Design a protein around this ligand. Structure first.
Ligand SMILES: COc1nc2ccc(Br)cc2cc1[C@@H](c1ccccc1)[C@@](O)(CCN(C)C)c1cccc2ccccc12
Ligand SMILES: COc1nc2ccc(Br)cc2cc1[C@@H](c1ccccc1)[C@@](O)(CCN(C)C)c1cccc2ccccc12
Ligand SMILES: COc1nc2ccc(Br)cc2cc1[C@@H](c1ccccc1)[C@@](O)(CCN(C)C)c1cccc2ccccc12
Ligand SMILES: COc1nc2ccc(Br)cc2cc1[C@@H](c1ccccc1)[C@@](O)(CCN(C)C)c1cccc2ccccc12
Ligand SMILES: COc1nc2ccc(Br)cc2cc1[C@@H](c1ccccc1)[C@@](O)(CCN(C)C)c1cccc2ccccc12
Ligand SMILES: COc1nc2ccc(Br)cc2cc1[C@@H](c1ccccc1)[C@@](O)(CCN(C)C)c1cccc2ccccc12
Ligand SMILES: COc1nc2ccc(Br)cc2cc1[C@@H](c1ccccc1)[C@@](O)(CCN(C)C)c1cccc2ccccc12
Lengths: 81, 37, 237, 118, 50, 81, 81, 81, 81, 81, 81, 81, 81
């Protein structure tokens, strides 16, 4: 009875982590593309570009970890016992 | 097979070692190099 | 076949401390200290400098340019020694893993006289949590015991106050698992590459080792850069 | 190598051969190597053009009112004013950068970039 | 005790690769910096006696 | 009867959260790319560039949250009796 | 017998919501990238840029909503009795 | 025997709708990105940019709708009677 | 044991149509992005920009249709029975 | 024995066709994007532009066809029976 | 014993070929986009743009080929028997 | 009881690694795209550009390697048992 | 016992190689796009452009290599009894 639920929880946590990884990796990559281009064109702008960057990143990474948290909820404290 | 994401007392030992190196450098490398520059 | 990071261990103060990752981080500490003393005896501002002086000069100038662009060397003279020691410590500790220290077995499978230190959650957690407490107390000293928490909760956009909170929880975690997972990966690979037969085991081992040198350098650099950036974010205004 | 022709409204500032021309257009810094796609751009107010030759040392020319044109022929820089590196006195170039007049402050900042400061 | 030999061959080829490719460029870099600071000290003394 | 339904609920919640995280992360990455590039090219635009940037984000995050909502419904209040 | 259909319904609804979330998130991100960049270039044009934007979004969100709709039809009113 | 085919039809319909939503959402986002950029660069062009746009969208949505059709045929008129 | 084959056929047809919809939607989106941008840059080029476009789309739709065809072969004329 | 392998072969062929269609659709979309943009830029380079294009497409389509081949090998000449 | 192992092998080979074809198609599309753009801007540069192109493609197809190999290893020489 | 939990752990770990690899590879590709473009524009900006490039690479591979750690936890020290 | 774990191992290895191929192919494609565009812009910087490229690609390939390793660990040296 419980082993099927354990397999389901493991596959669900894997899906959560995979989605979080895809989203976070690609979003950070796009934001960093913007940052590297802006700093390559104008070096002195580096500082004033960290303010939008770490806002965007701050959102993106948020998703990942939020998902990370929920992955734990699936795998360590399975919502169905 | 044990959960390797659980910290041991090792956490402190390593800390101490780092807390030694950070001193040594912080006293014996960065001030002389900064003075040389 | 492959088995994951079990540790030769012993109880030192009622707390189970690993033999490995205390031997290896100690060797890294002694190597950094030996390099430091060798510089203490050979640092010359008068004539041409040697090799160790040039190495530490490069590291110090790079990290000082970083601290100057980020927060300012007039406001934060300690971030420079912190960044330098973080870089050199992590770099030496990760580069010690290149050594031919794998020696198959007494019985069964692969084994090493020295596991890399960053392949342990205690090592990376010590580094990340020390940096965490340091930049939070630097933010407190720069802004106040009551102004620094409200600034962490406000951020650059106050309406995003929950998201900002998540950021503050995610900075240590990231810093510690980007390096664990990374160096940890290396471990597993050299253990599964040791399942090949000897005549066809040298090529993947050499490719992985040669690229793990660059990976360890880049990981030390990322840890130090992000430490400097976190200090500049916690001490702003 | 590429052929640089820096001309001003009333005189040819410089003309010669180079291996790398660094400047800064209104969209960012740029560096031209011998072969390079045709391009037309406008330099910044306080623009400095750094020219690099094989044996010599880098020329460094403060340009005021410039337009960059890369073609098959080479690089051509139109200027309203230009001042080489070893013709600027940093005192007037510094106390003019602090001025309240926009274009004269830009000229001072260009001369300051050319002398080495900022 | 045969993984030891395989890893040792791996270490030999990696140190050969570094001694072939990497150590020449870093040697050239540190030598260029050494000679630059040497020239700096030399012309410092020259300007002093001038 | 319940083990299978609970496994399916965990896998469905994992899929919901994976999709939400991919969408949220990549949409925030693209929007923040636009923000960083606009702040780089036109610095003074910074303030005004925050009125579109959040609109976009307010849409993107919306999707994520709604998925989150239903993910909860899947694992805490499973709609199947 | 109904447990297997219910597991299938939950996995299907998870798939529908995941796909809708990926589509909506990334489409809103791309449209908002265009919006933020156009507002950065022409600062005064914001008012004239909301009629194409809200058209684009109007389509994108539409897909999401429809998926949401059908997800409900899967988990509450399962099309196989 | 019916529960297995019913669960299969539910999962297949979920996959169809998910793929259609991803495709339609991201394609409409890309086309709308082009439309917003064109309008922002020269606004008078608006009326002439809607004949390419609605061609593009006209194709994209078509895919979506066709998928929707077959989704129904999977769950409501399951081809395995 | 035929229901297992029927469920596998339904899931495979769903996968085929989902992949086809994703590919077709995003390909039409990118090609139409190019078309709208080319018409916005200079409108007189419209009549000359429909030979490339309908080549591009002509391939993209092709893929979709082929998938559609094979999806039929999976659900209506199952290749293995 | 036979039915599980048949269902697995059907699902595997579905995955192969979905991946092929996604890859081919989006690759043709990006290549055609470049083609349309280049023809809009330089209208009298059309012929000169079709030799790189048909190279790129020739690679992309190749992948699709190869996948198509193996899809047949999965559903018509199942390797393991 | 053998039937479920063969079914898992078929599904795994399908996943391998799907991922390989997605990666190869979209990587070829992006590289060829760059090539077509560079030839549309400078026709005489077609000769010198084939050396970076065929490097990129050389890497991209490599992934494809590797996946192809493992697909065979999964369906013709199943590693667990 | 253990075999199905082990299968679930293996599939979940595969999903985690797949998502992490997709995200990391594409994000590193986009960041390196920005780096190579910025060096092509001004070939004497490498050292200046290696700071934002490696900040972005740090974030992207942070996502990747946290997923790697949790995958190793799944398949080596399975949380549920 | 063993057949379930073998099927799960084959499916997980397929997922790992699929994610790795997608990531590596598309990341190498984006980096090579940057390389071709840079060699088109500045043909005399090609050498200077292989230092960023082979860093980017290098990092990307690192990810692929790890995935490859773990796929073997799943398929030849299954980490579960
Ligand atoms: C920008 O934030 C938002 N904007 C929205 C916009 C529209 C709608 Br309708 C819902 C929105 C919801 C939110 C957040 C929120 C804040 C407070 C409570 C609930 C939800 C959020 O969903 C952000 C998730 N993102 C970043 C991936 C969130 C969810 C779950 C846990 C969080 C933990 C910490 C912070 C944010 C957390
Ligand atoms: C822009 O919003 C829309 N535009 C549409 C456009 C076309 C069509 Br045909 C349907 C549309 C529907 C909506 C919303 C809506 C508004 C009111 C009622 C029902 C649906 C929405 O579906 C959008 C979800 N997005 C934002 C991810 C929604 C659903 C569920 C919960 C929401 C919570 C908060 C906000 C929006 C919420
Ligand atoms: C633009 O709308 C279209 N264009 C098409 C173009 C070609 C083809 Br061949 C089919 C097309 C079909 C439609 C719609 C439609 C309208 C009415 C009936 C059937 C289909 C649509 O399918 C759009 C879905 N999109 C937005 C994700 C839709 C479906 C279901 C509910 C809707 C509710 C509200 C609006 C649109 C709704
Ligand atoms: C442009 O349309 C095409 N171009 C092709 C190009 C090459 C090849 Br080889 C096949 C092509 C096929 C078609 C259509 C078509 C038209 C008529 C009959 C059959 C197929 C299409 O497949 C388009 C699907 N797209 C839009 C997602 C379609 C299928 C099914 C239902 C449709 C309903 C409405 C409209 C189009 C419908
Ligand atoms: C562009 O056409 C090609 N170029 C190739 C290039 C390289 C290689 Br190695 C194989 C190639 C194969 C083809 C076609 C082809 C033509 C004839 C026979 C077999 C295959 C194609 O596969 C195109 C599929 N695309 C469009 C998704 C196709 C398959 C099936 C049905 C089609 C129906 C109509 C048109 C094309 C059809
Ligand atoms: C460009 O072609 C390559 N470049 C490579 C580059 C690196 C490596 Br390491 C392997 C490479 C392999 C190849 C081909 C090849 C040629 C001959 C034998 C085996 C493989 C290829 O794999 C291309 C697949 N692409 C197009 C999706 C292929 C496979 C199968 C059938 C094909 C039929 C027709 C054409 C190509 C066919
Ligand atoms: C660029 O090549 C690399 N760069 C790396 C960079 C970092 C690290 Br840490 C590992 C790297 C590993 C490699 C290759 C390699 C070369 C030799 C032995 C093992 C691995 C590679 O993995 C590339 C796969 N890519 C291109 C999809 C490969 C694997 C398997 C079969 C191949 C067949 C042909 C060519 C390459 C083949």
């Amino acid at each position: 009875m419980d082993p099927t639920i354990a397999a389901g929880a493991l596959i669900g946590g894997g899906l959560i982590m995979a989605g979080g990884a895809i989203g976070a990796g690609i979003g950070d990559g796009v934001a960093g593309n913007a940052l590297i281009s802006g700093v390559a064109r104008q070096p002195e702008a580096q500082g004033r570009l960290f303010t939008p960057f770490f806002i965007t990143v701050g959102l993106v990474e948020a998703a990942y970890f939020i998902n990370l948290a929920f992955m734990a909820l699936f795998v360590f404290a399975t919502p169905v016992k | 097979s044990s959960n390797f994401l659980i910290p041991n007392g090792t956490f402190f030992v390593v800390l101490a070692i780092f807390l030694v190196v950070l001193a040594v450098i912080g006293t014996f490398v960065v001030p002389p190099i900064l003075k040389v520059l | 076949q492959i088995e994951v990071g079990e540790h030769h261990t012993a109880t030192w103060l009622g707390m189970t401390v690993n033999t490995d990752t205390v031997l290896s981080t100690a060797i890294a500490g002694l190597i950094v200290i030996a390099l430091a003393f060798y510089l203490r005896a050979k640092v010359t501002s008068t004539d041409v400098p040697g090799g160790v002086q040039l190495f530490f000069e490069a590291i110090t100038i790079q990290m000082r340019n970083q601290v100057e662009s980020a927060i300012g060397m007039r406001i934060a003279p300690f971030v420079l020694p912190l960044a330098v020691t973080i870089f050199v410590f992590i770099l030496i500790s990760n580069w010690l893993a290149v050594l031919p220290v794998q020696y198959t077995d007494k019985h069964g499978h692969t084994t090493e006289l020295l596991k890399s230190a960053a392949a342990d959650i205690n090592y990376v957690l010590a580094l990340a949590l020390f940096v965490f407490v340091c930049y939070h107390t630097a933010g407190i000293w720069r802004r106040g015991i009551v102004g620094h928490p409200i600034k962490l909760l406000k951020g650059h956009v106050t309406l995003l106050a929950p998201i900002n909170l998540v950021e503050e929880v995610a900075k240590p975690i990231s810093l510690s698992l980007r390096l664990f997972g990374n160096i940890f990966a290396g471990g597993i690979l050299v253990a599964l590459i040791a399942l090949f037969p000897p005549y066809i085991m040298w090529a993947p081992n050499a490719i992985w080792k040669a690229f793990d040198l660059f990976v360890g350098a880049i990981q030390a650099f990322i840890f130090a850069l992000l430490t400097i950036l976190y200090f500049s974010q916690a001490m702003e205004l | 190598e590429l052929n640089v022709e820096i001309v001003a409204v009333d005189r040819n500032i410089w003309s010669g051969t180079a291996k790398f021309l660094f400047t800064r257009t209104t969209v960012g810094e740029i560096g031209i190597l011998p072969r390079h796609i045709p391009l037309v751009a406008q330099l910044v107010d306080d623009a400095m053009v750094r020219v690099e030759r094989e044996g010599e040392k880098d020329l460094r020319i403060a340009v005021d009112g410039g337009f960059l044109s890369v073609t098959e022929e080479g690089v051509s820089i139109l200027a309203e004013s230009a001042e080489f590196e070893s013709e600027i006195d940093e005192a007037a170039a510094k106390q003019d950068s602090e001025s309240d007049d926009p274009r004269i402050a830009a000229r001072g900042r260009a001369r300051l970039r050319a002398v080495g400061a900022i | 005790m045969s993984t030891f030999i395989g890893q040792l061959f791996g270490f030999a080829v990696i140190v050969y690769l570094v001694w072939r490719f990497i150590v020449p460029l870093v040697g050239r870099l540190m030598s260029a910096r050494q000679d630059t600071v040497r020239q700096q000290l030399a012309d410092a003394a020259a300007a002093a006696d001038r």
